[PDB]
Amino acid sequence: VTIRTRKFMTNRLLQRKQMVIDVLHPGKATVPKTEIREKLAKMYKTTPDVIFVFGFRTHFGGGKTTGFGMIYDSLDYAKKNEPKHRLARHGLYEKKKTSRKQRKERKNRMKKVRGTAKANVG
Amino acid sequence: ARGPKKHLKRVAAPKHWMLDKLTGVFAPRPSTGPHKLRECLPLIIFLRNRLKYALTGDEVKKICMQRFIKIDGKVRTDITYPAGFMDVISIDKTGENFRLIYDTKGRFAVHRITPEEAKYKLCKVRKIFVGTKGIPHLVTHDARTIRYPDPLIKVNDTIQIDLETGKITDFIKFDTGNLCMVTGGANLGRIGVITNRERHPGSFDVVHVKDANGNSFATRLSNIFVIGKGNKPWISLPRGKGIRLTIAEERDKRL
Amino acid sequence: KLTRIAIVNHDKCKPKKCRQECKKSCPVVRMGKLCIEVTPQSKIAWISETLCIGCGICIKKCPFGALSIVNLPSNLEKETTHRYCANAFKLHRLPIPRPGEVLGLVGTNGIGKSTALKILAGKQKPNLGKYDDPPDWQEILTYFRGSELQNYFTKILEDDLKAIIKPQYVDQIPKAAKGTVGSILDRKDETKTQAIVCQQLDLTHLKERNVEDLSGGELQRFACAVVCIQKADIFMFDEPSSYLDVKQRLKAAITIRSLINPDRYIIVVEHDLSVLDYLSDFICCLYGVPSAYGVVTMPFSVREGINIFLDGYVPTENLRFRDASYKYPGMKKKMGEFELAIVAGEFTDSEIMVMLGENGTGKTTFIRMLAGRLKPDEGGEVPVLNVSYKPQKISPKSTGSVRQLLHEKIRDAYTHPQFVTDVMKPLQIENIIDQEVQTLSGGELQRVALALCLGKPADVYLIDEPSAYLDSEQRLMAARVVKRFILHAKKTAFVVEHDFIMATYLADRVIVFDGVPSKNTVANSPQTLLAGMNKFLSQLEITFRRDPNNYRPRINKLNSIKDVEQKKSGNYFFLD
Amino acid sequence: KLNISFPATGCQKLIEVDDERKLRTFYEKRMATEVAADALGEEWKGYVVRISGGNDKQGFPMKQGVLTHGRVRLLLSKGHSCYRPRRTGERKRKSVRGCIVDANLSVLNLVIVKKGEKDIPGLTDTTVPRRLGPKRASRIRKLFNLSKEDDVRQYVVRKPLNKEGKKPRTKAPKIQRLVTPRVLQHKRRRIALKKQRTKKNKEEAAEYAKLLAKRMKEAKEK
RNA sequence: AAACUGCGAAUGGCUCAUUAAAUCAGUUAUGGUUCCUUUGGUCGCUCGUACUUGGAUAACUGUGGUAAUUCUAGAGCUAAUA
RNA sequence: CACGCCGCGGCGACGACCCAUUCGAACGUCUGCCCUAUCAACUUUCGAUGGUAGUCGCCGUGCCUACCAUGGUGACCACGGGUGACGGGGAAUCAGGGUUCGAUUCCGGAGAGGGAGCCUGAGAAACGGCUACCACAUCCAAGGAAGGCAGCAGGCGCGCAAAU
Numbered sequence A: 001v002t003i004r005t006r007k008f009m010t011n012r013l014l015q016r017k018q019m020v021i022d023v024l025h026p027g028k029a030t031v032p033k034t035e036i037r038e039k040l041a042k043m044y045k046t047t048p049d050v051i052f053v054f055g056f057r058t059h060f061g062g063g064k065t066t067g068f069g070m071i072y073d074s075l076d077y078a079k080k081n082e083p084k085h086r087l088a089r090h091g092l093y094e095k096k097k098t099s100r101k102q103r104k105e106r107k108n109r110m111k112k113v114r115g116t117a118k119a120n121v122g
Numbered sequence B: 001a002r003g004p005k006k007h008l009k010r011v012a013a014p015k016h017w018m019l020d021k022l023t024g025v026f027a028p029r030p031s032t033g034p035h036k037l038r039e040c041l042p043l044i045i046f047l048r049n050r051l052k053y054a055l056t057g058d059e060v061k062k063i064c065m066q067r068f069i070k071i072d073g074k075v076r077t078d079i080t081y082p083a084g085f086m087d088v089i090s091i092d093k094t095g096e097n098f099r100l101i102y103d104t105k106g107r108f109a110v111h112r113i114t115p116e117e118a119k120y121k122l123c124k125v126r127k128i129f130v131g132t133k134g135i136p137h138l139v140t141h142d143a144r145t146i147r148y149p150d151p152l153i154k155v156n157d158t159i160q161i162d163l164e165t166g167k168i169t170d171f172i173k174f175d176t177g178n179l180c181m182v183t184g185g186a187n188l189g190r191i192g193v194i195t196n197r198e199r200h201p202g203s204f205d206v207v208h209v210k211d212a213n214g215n216s217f218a219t220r221l222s223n224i225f226v227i228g229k230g231n232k233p234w235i236s237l238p239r240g241k242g243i244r245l246t247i248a249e250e251r252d253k254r255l
Numbered sequence C: 001k002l003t004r005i006a007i008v009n010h011d012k013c014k015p016k017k018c019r020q021e022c023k024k025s026c027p028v029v030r031m032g033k034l035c036i037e038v039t040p041q042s043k044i045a046w047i048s049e050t051l052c053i054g055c056g057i058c059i060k061k062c063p064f065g066a067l068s069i070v071n072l073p074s075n076l077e078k079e080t081t082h083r084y085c086a087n088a089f090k091l092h093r094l095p096i097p098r099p100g101e102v103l104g105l106v107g108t109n110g111i112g113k114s115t116a117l118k119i120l121a122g123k124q125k126p127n128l129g130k131y132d133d134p135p136d137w138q139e140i141l142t143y144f145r146g147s148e149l150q151n152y153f154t155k156i157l158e159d160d161l162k163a164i165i166k167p168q169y170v171d172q173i174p175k176a177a178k179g180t181v182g183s184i185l186d187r188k189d190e191t192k193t194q195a196i197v198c199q200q201l202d203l204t205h206l207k208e209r210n211v212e213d214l215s216g217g218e219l220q221r222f223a224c225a226v227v228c229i230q231k232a233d234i235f236m237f238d239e240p241s242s243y244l245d246v247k248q249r250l251k252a253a254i255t256i257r258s259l260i261n262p263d264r265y266i267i268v269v270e271h272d273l274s275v276l277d278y279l280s281d282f283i284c285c286l287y288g289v290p291s292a293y294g295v296v297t298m299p300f301s302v303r304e305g306i307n308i309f310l311d312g313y314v315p316t317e318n319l320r321f322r323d324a325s326y327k328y329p330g331m332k333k334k335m336g337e338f339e340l341a342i343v344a345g346e347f348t349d350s351e352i353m354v355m356l357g358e359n360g361t362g363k364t365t366f367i368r369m370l371a372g373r374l375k376p377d378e379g380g381e382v383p384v385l386n387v388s389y390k391p392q393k394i395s396p397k398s399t400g401s402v403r404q405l406l407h408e409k410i411r412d413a414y415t416h417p418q419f420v421t422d423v424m425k426p427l428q429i430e431n432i433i434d435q436e437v438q439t440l441s442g443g444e445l446q447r448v449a450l451a452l453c454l455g456k457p458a459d460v461y462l463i464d465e466p467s468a469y470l471d472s473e474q475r476l477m478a479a480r481v482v483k484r485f486i487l488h489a490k491k492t493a494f495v496v497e498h499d500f501i502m503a504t505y506l507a508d509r510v511i512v513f514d515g516v517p518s519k520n521t522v523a524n525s526p527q528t529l530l531a532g533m534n535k536f537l538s539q540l541e542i543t544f545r546r547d548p549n550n551y552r553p554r555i556n557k558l559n560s561i562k563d564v565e566q567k568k569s570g571n572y573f574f575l576d
Numbered sequence D: 001k002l003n004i005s006f007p008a009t010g011c012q013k014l015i016e017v018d019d020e021r022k023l024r025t026f027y028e029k030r031m032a033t034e035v036a037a038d039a040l041g042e043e044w045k046g047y048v049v050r051i052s053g054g055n056d057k058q059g060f061p062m063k064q065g066v067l068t069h070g071r072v073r074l075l076l077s078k079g080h081s082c083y084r085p086r087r088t089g090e091r092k093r094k095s096v097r098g099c100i101v102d103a104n105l106s107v108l109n110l111v112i113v114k115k116g117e118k119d120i121p122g123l124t125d126t127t128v129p130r131r132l133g134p135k136r137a138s139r140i141r142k143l144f145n146l147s148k149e150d151d152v153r154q155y156v157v158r159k160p161l162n163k164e165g166k167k168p169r170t171k172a173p174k175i176q177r178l179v180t181p182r183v184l185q186h187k188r189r190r191i192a193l194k195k196q197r198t199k200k201n202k203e204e205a206a207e208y209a210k211l212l213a214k215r216m217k218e219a220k221e222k
Numbered sequence E: 001a002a003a004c005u006g007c008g009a010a011u012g013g014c015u016c017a018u019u020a021a022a023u024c025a026g027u028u029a030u031g032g033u034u035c036c037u038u039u040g041g042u043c044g045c046u047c048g049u050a051c052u053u054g055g056a057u058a059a060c061u062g063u064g065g066u067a068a069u070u071c072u073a074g075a076g077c078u079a080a081u082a
Numbered sequence F: 001c002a003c004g005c006c007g008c009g010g011c012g013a014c015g016a017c018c019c020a021u022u023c024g025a026a027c028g029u030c031u032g033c034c035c036u037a038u039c040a041a042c043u044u045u046c047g048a049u050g051g052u053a054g055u056c057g058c059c060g061u062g063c064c065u066a067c068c069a070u071g072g073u074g075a076c077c078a079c080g081g082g083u084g085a086c087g088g089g090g091a092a093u094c095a096g097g098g099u100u101c102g103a104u105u106c107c108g109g110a111g112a113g114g115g116a117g118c119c120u121g122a123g124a125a126a127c128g129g130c131u132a133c134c135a136c137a138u139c140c141a142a143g144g145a146a147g148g149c150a151g152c153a154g155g156c157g158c159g160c161a162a163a164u
Ligand SMILES: Nc1ncnc2c1ncn2[C@@H]1O[C@H](COP(=O)(O)OP(=O)(O)OP(=O)(O)O)[C@@H](O)[C@H]1O
Pocket: C209, C212, C213, C214, C215, C216, C217, C218, C243, C244, C245, C335, C336, C337, C357, C358, C359, C360, C361, C362, C363, C364, C365, C392, C518
């Protein structure tokens, strides 16, 4: 309902703006991050899917919620600099699931052979 | 241990890096470099914890591989490169320049310098010898080896070098009456004018300093770094200017 | 709590020189009940197996330490996975499946080896040993918490890993399968390969006969085809060497490893264990009292897990589960597709005849015409008196218990004594005589049907396939059952076998079925045991070999140092 | 068995040689000695074959230096035959067979030294052209007999590659040790750095000699 | 993709069995020694085919042994910061 | 990689004899360790202390070899034995004093079943390297092959006593 932004650092090295979000929502549940992105994109004259928020902790008692948010210059700098789990929260990215134990068994079984056979030993 | 070590835990790190206890088990080990392991700042500490340009440890690497950060006017891709005690850390994308200077609590400060000031640094000359058909050499405290020095330069002097070229512009001789900074032990960071040196055969020499307030201390001779000629400092200083206030006056100043 | 037993080895236990400290330190001896009985004039200590309490006092008091403590299995109810009913069988543990390799399961029958397959395939939610109030799938997935399988069962519950089984009861499949082998196999392929699955399993010569046409060998190999073409990841192969000869058993073994993608989950369960060294990569083992409880051990390797089981002592636990290591002429039938031309051979009394065949060679047609049926040529012998006949596939239809069925419908005036002490007491049907014959599994069904065919008086006994649906332990029990029965009754018998160790032991006389397998056949004149196996194993081009200490027949690698030097002299098995 | 190889055309065949009176000119001769191969058939009249190794009855290979009929255990290393190390400096003790031929081998590998008069039905009727022809500068100019002004780039051997379902193409190897202007630019750069380095040396020497005479003026004035 | 080459595999982890002037701790020294790597110095200082030289061996192709291994043997090719 | 200027070139990654200092490592100095005399005399010319000349080592030296000298430690407790003895930063009690504990997350040492001996490498007496012997164990076609949880989980066993 009400966004206040604590300490603001505009960051010319990673091409973003860095700030700490305050969210006052005194009669409601914890607000979704999509609504925070729409309110801050209406605040900073930019489009809502170049801005990325994370880590919102609701304080004890029903009061404010305080987390981080960063506003990028363009989506291509976002596809270079943002972490892949945070892009995958937006549907811009998806990981191939094996994930760790079948890869390790395929790593210790591809040591037993030599030549072109490493491709056709799975 | 059957070889060199490659890791450094967090609670065994230096106190003046001001690390947490619960972010992880390990601290970044500084790379082998010009500066010692207990007496340096890596870049990953300096960009992540002091300036907050990068929140997590991968983003310091994403900063440094874009050839952004200059250490002494040279582009440095190692994120654990040691820097300290007037390494001029220069970032040209934002136009800022930083000189690593101990504040009077003993910690490496974020202390900003002028863009005209970042073409020089000071260096304490630690070893003077001759070589190889009489070529005189000079070894600074950050292991710059300079051939053909001024022949009045002796050990424990301070020279000023040009950071583009690597050549000596002028030098300061070690005396009483020069302004001084400590790089040292319990009296690390205090700035004053030298009053004495007691010379001992076979052991560390003790040098007595008197401050701008007039309170006096003394440290060993390997901890004394001459800043300037006379009482004129040659660099930009931190905002307290090296005067150690006691815990009573520091509480009264915080009041 | 497991029962512990003190175990003495014979070596380093010389009782004359170490002053008998084990007996004098024991507490059970120090009341006077003799668990330990030694003397200094002896060669061994003897520690009693039901008078040892298992408290470990005797172990530390020995000069030449020879005394081990060894578990004997019991009802534990510790990490139970599934129990079936009230006062019923309790499957304690679950086997662990592995990607890209084959898992074998060996053990006794009635121990729960098929029940383990139905839980890992999504076909049962186990009730965690609680049959009144079954926990549902959420709380099942918090009981395998901290294991791999509460990820693996999550792949089952959303069907992310599909599970198809081969059924154990292979003879009953055409009741839900109508028509031809070409139609019923090829509409459910869902992968159009159609090229390896028949040639590795000797098929497309059986594809215009009906699914109801096949005998039990060809009935078996059809079902190995119907799982293998299918697109899934989790396959369970129930007893795949049932009803098969040795040559087709190796071809079934090779095709199972052709089902390995490294993402596929293959576990198998065998009772033959002479192709198991060519079939699996890791082997779990099932101990316990049969049909009271069964537990799965940890997986051991192929060569390792067999020799653990054959000694019967598991080394990863300290558990010991076993201490033991007159004239007939020849004729032509053609049923509808192909003829069998028997050559006219002689016949004897008080001797044994063993048919040596192939998958479709005519064994279950030759055992019908000796009963006087299906005789289109003139001649062929009729026996003078009535005949006993065992069928291949027993699809029983009965009323009630077996005490009506065995004990008052065949020989209501019994022939005991002597019938039961010779025949029935090793065959152990007095324990299952309370249970009805309709609920029976294939092990007891085969075992109960032999009791009538021995229990009938007749002159020629037609006995076929005793090594279907049984484990390895009660397959040498059947051999001393049949040898001591018919050579003391002084009558003769036809025995029909697939297994190598059974057919070697009994055989007086040998009838060999030559020719092209299942397309034109000839039943030869009766040969001896020595030349009869050594001719027939030259039709397999497969050479057998005794392991020297547990007498197990093992098969040579096909072109090897042992194989070509045995096929040179034509001794395809020494001392038949 | 015998594994007979023809090195001139590169085809090999595996025959079963079953009588052992046929093989008596092979026994009691060491490895890599030519034998008179007239005696194991009628088709071998002018071919002499080289004994180039083999395997034991139990499958272990034969080494050239080992001088017995039986088997030894030797400490092998990098550069030895019958061994491939895992790590740098690994040595493992392995079992090999000697170089002496006897009747207890499983294969005796044979390389035809000189061709006879007849044709052997799998070896001498077909040739395979050598794939992956030469890549260096001088193996091309030595194979095709070029000269000091001749262009090496025009006589490289091409691989014609055809596949069902792919468009046809010709593919050539990357020629190494070829003097292009990139290499001459690198040499010119290195001689330029030699020039800059000695220019630095003599200018700093003259500068310090001037400054030292200026200082010794100041130090002689006491 | 593979294999050659270079580097790392000597750090991390785990436990406390040996060890009572030994370990270890503060201290002091290497003027009695080595130091991969980083960072600066040095690298036309030498008065005596070069517009770039040679031989192979792997990946690959082809024949196999051994019941059995991250076993490897014979034949044919071709590179280098080997 | 950038591309040229009328022969000559800019920016780099890689390279090495050497010197410096950077992580260290190694060997040394002064001082500090729990109980026992039912351990008061120990150490030996084949090394115990020292001298000279060497070998060897990365260097200093009985480190080792040759020749010569008869030394060295000791109730200010040597030497021998015990230890459920890794050492330290520390812990629990605590008026001041003490007493007891410290295997344990940081540092330093030692070892990968017992002992040895080595390859590579700057760095090892490496054991997620090799070579044997001892001890115990797996598969075998009885010709041979491969071993090391005091890594994370796990099972055996011992236990009062310790997790997926
Ligand atoms: N009803 C039928 N119609 C047509 N053909 C049939 C019919 N029944 C059997 N056959 C054919 O006659 C042959 C008889 O098979 P046979 O009884 O020899 O097999 P079997 O000996 O029981 O095999 P195994 O003993 O290995 O189980 C089969 O090959 C089958 O194809």
